[PDB]
Structures are given as structure tokens and as C-alpha cells.
Amino acid sequence: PYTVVYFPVRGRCAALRMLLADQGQSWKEEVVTVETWQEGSLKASCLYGQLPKFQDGDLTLYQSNTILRHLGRTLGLYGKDQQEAALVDMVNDGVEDLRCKYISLIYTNYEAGKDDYVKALPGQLKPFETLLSQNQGGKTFIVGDQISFADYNLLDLLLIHEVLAPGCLDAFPLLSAYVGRLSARPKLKAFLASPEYVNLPINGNGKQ
Amino acid sequence: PYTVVYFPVRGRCAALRMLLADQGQSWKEEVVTVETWQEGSLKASCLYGQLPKFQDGDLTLYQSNTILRHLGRTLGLYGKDQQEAALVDMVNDGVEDLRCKYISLIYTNYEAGKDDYVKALPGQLKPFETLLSQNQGGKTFIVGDQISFADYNLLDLLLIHEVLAPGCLDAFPLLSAYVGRLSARPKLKAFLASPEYVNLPINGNGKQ
Numbered sequence A, B: 001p002y003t004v005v006y007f008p009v010r011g012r013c014a015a016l017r018m019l020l021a022d023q024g025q026s027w028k029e030e031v032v033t034v035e036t037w038q039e040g041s042l043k044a045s046c047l048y049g050q051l052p053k054f055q056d057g058d059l060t061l062y063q064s065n066t067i068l069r070h071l072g073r074t075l076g077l078y079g080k081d082q083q084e085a086a087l088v089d090m091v092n093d094g095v096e097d098l099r100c101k102y103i104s105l106i107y108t109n110y111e112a113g114k115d116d117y118v119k120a121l122p123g124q125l126k127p128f129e130t131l132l133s134q135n136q137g138g139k140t141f142i143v144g145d146q147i148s149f150a151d152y153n154l155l156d157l158l159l160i161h162e163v164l165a166p167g168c169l170d171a172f173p174l175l176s177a178y179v180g181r182l183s184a185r186p187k188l189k190a191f192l193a194s195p196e197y198v199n200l201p202i203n204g205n206g207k208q
């Protein structure tokens, strides 16, 4: 079945976890402690020397977005056709771009870079609001009328940014309602309120 | 048909161009000058305010990796099954990770960071050599026995690094032979020797 190997943080595993939970899938969490990691053996066995590591039967995967696309492909959360599949990728690549900046700020220069980052945030979120405005008035999902892996990834992106910059979605009504709507999905809402998610820090350095 | 909108550089369009050329596809190049860009009109119309922009019929796309996956999906260069498709993604995500570091060095701190970057390069390339060593002794492609979009992206990554750090592939027999082998493909070899590729700078700031 499914196994996710990661440090005890939400980080790059939050979106895929939301996906599995919302889709009613079962998986095992293999928690790797900083000590175990510093031992070196696991890290040396990882393709790119990093986590998360994911297992689907004997298929071993690395790279958070590969896991998301794999689950999206296998579970039918990758658009209804090739055109939608491309739009889903366009959304996810954009989500990834901002996540990288978020990650850089959090771990590289939180104190000195936060003000500049928050000032530039609106412009960074505008694209997703626009995407929403062009798809059924933003009443359904980011692409098409069915959920996709990019939805879970974008939702996480938005959630963590509201912790970083409380109220950042006030400027974006479609994104605001989208967060509330997706968060209300029964299995997702239950997962998001579970200690399995809540008692885990967003990042690994105590910043958010 | 196909249209790629970009600045007059190889950058993030090199891989997809190699793909189209090698696959015998025709496309139009719409060159955007720094002046035209600074005007602001085109940039404001771009989803994430950046290039490349890609057009396939009435389908408009942004994000270099979205264009690669779209071409891979529609042209049959995305693995033979879901398992291979995931491995292709894993390779491309890894290629993207290193490309981002390469781009950061080139445009952010070439002079001061080059030495450290080159020292860390072997460890950054090892994963791709390992990937090749696990797929038919590295005698075919990065994943499976058929070419994929990740091949064109990895090939470009390797080509530009050979310019940045001559001989970086010497210690990697599989990657070395792979570059020579893929570069020898008739249509690709012809494209790589054409002025449309050769007379274009790798990057936009005169560094490489």
C-alpha cells in the first residue's frame, strides 16, 4: 500500500497527506528523527539524499511533486483530458515556485526577509485568484469541475501563508471561499482537525 | 501549431526546443526583446508575469516544465505506463532542482559562488548516473527503453554544466556516453549544430 517517509513536520508532505485522507486512502507514516538522519545511512540510500521518500508497493519514489502527480495519475485527480492535465501542471508549477520562496524565507532569512516577502505576497497570490475567476466563477476547483492534485497543493500553500501573513486572503475573495470550501470537505475537515496533522509543526525550525 | 515566446536565450526553452526538433515537430519562435518586456504590456498578460509562454492551437501555457510535460503527454514521451511516468517525473523534478541552483548561481552570485558550486557538483550529478546504472546498464534512456521529456531536460542540464565546469562528466561513464549518444540522434545533432541554437547565449547575463 502507501508509505510516506519523512521528518515529523508538515512541510512538503502536507498536500499529499490531505490528498490521501480526502480520497479515503490508507497509508503508513514512517517518522524519521533528526538523529536517525544524521546517522547517514538512510540519507545515502535516498536518490537525491533527501526526504520525503514514498512507497507504493515496491515502487519507491522521491520528490514531493512526483508523489503528488503519481497519486493524481493513479487516483484520477489529473484533469479530464490532456488540456486540463496541462492546466493542472501549470497550477502546480506555480504553487511550487511560491513554495520554494516560502521555504527559502522560513529556513534562510525569516527575520530580515519577512517584511519584503509579505509586501510581495499579494502579487504572488493574484495568479491563483485569476485562475479561479476563469473557471466557473471560482465556484468549483482550480482546474475543471473535478478536484486535482494541484488543488491539495495550492490549498496547503494558502493555508500556510495565512499563518505567515494573517489576512492575506482578504484581498482575494475567490481564494478565500475556495479555502473554506475545500477545507469543509468531510474527510479533509476531519483530517485537518486530527492531532495527526495539528500536533505537527508546519516547518522544522520552529518558524511559520 | 506550436509557438514559443521567450527572450533570445537558450535558458528554460532549450530542452523543449531539443524535444520538438528531435521529434520532427515544427514551431514558431516569437522573440521578446528586453525593451519590449520593459514596456510592461506582455508581462502583465502572462499568468505568473514571466516567460516562456507557449501556444498549442488555442491552448496557451506557461511554466517551462508544464510545456515539457504537455509535449511529453501529447507526443508519447512520458513512459510506457504509470510506473514509468512516475519515474520520469522523479527524474525531471531532480533536474529542475539542480537547474534552479544553476540559475541562482549564474544570475545571483557567479563570482563568489562558482567554486563552492563546482565542488558540490559531483554529488549533484551522481543521482542521474545511478538512475542510468539501474536502467539496462545505462545503454538506453534515463527511464525505460523509450525517450521521454525528462531526457531532453536532463541532457540540457548536463550540456550547460559541461560549459560551466568542463570535464564534470569524466568521472561518470554512463552520463558521458548518454550525452554523446543522445546528441548523436540525427535531428537533434542537426539542431544542436544549427545557428538558431549555437548563436543563442545559454543565459541572459553573459555568464555560463
Ligand SMILES: CCCCCCCCCSC[C@H](NC(=O)CC[C@H](N)C(=O)O)C(=O)NCC(=O)O
Pocket (backbone or CB within 6 Å): A007, A008, A009, A011, A012, A034, A043, A049, A050, A051, A052, A062, A063, A064, A065, A203, A204, A205, B097
Ligand atoms: C523537527 C525536526 C525536523 C527535521 C529537519 C527539518 C526538515 C525540513 C523538511 S525536509 C528538507 C529537505 N528536503 C527537501 O528539501 C525536499 C525537496 C524535494 N525537491 C521535494 O520536493 O521533495 C531534506 O531532506 N533535508 C535533509 C538533507 O538535505 O540533509
Ligand SMILES: CCCCCCCCCSC[C@H](NC(=O)CC[C@H](N)C(=O)O)C(=O)NCC(=O)O
Pocket (backbone or CB within 6 Å): A093, A097, B007, B008, B009, B011, B012, B034, B043, B049, B050, B051, B052, B062, B063, B064, B065, B203, B204, B205
Ligand atoms: C539577452 C537578454 C535575455 C533576457 C534577460 C534574461 C532572461 C532570463 C530568462 S527569463 C527569466 C524569468 N522567467 C522564469 O524564471 C521562468 C520560471 C518558470 N517557473 C518556468 O519554469 O518557466 C522571467 O520571465 N523574467 C522576466 C520577469 O520576471 O519580468
